[PDB]
Symmetry: C3
Subunit: 133 residues, 3 copies
Amino acid sequence: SLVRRIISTAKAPAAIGPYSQAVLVDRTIYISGQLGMDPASGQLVPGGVVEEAKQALTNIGEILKAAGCDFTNVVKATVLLADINDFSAVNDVYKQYFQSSFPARAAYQVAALPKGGRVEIEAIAVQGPLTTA
Amino acid sequence: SLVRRIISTAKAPAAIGPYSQAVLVDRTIYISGQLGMDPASGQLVPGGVVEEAKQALTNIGEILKAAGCDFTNVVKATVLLADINDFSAVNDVYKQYFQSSFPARAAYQVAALPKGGRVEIEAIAVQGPLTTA
Amino acid sequence: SSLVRRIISTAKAPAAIGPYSQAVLVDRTIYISGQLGMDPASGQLVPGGVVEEAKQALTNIGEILKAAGCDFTNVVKATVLLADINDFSAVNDVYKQYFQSSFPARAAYQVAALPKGGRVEIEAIAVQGPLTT
């Protein structure tokens, strides 16, 4: 018998429809893809891909928080871009949220994201305590 | 020593080539991406995205079945679309398979799917018994 | 209880330039970063086209698995990202040469673009043995 619980925080855009912000099953946390949406206005923050990336990571942070975790628990992330040329800029924003023991990752350009977003990020985390390498 | 088992069912399109319909390892189930293909035929069902979506999900339901699971065991799903504008049409179909404790999700438009498919869904499940909070 | 989380690193696989690790072992699951057909010593793509890149990408994944004490039989899920869906056949012929039985679950589709102009990228998930199938 494994425990499964739905993560939900008002500090991140509400999950409207048949999905959850994140699902914690046993020790693993699956987080839905996050866009650069402001939790309050439900709209994408202005500024373009760079600011959208900050918000998307902010949203991920709040979800991790609600699950008793922080960015150090992320083991895998997927960076979806609307334009492969934004790779470098998003990478520099991305590194602002991690110190070391970085997560495994995949990054590429898709044809289009919801709401005309320029970037969407999804991740997988493992609830602590963790005994690093 | 972890137990790994290859899932196979006649109720879903046959894995032709170097892959399996799904792999169950320990208690996590990795299900291969499913298109709206007829199990016996192996051909894309006519009708378009809405029809393909129903078939794809049906195929997933059978895979889960053959693994001793149902839709309540799904913790994460990815919805790949040929057109981001078919999301609502697909979402309406998708919601008919879940009652609560919805899976984490990510949806976006890719450039092209196999066989000119209009939608593809991959999912991750965790074999129960499962106790929610 | 405490879980082990180690960063996999090998000079025999392309260096992870950005803020990510080649792979992350957590408990017994190994999340491997998407691999391009890059030469480990130069960090640049291998000449020859999609087929040559695929071979290199898989050998890159091979070295990463080896450093984690695994081989291709430990892969339970793989995702093949293509720059052109029409290259699926050619990539699949190279792919089948690395797996003999109990193939991993899979998902394959075309994206808009990959880093460095690569023609193929493969990400995978493996589980540390001993595994009983």
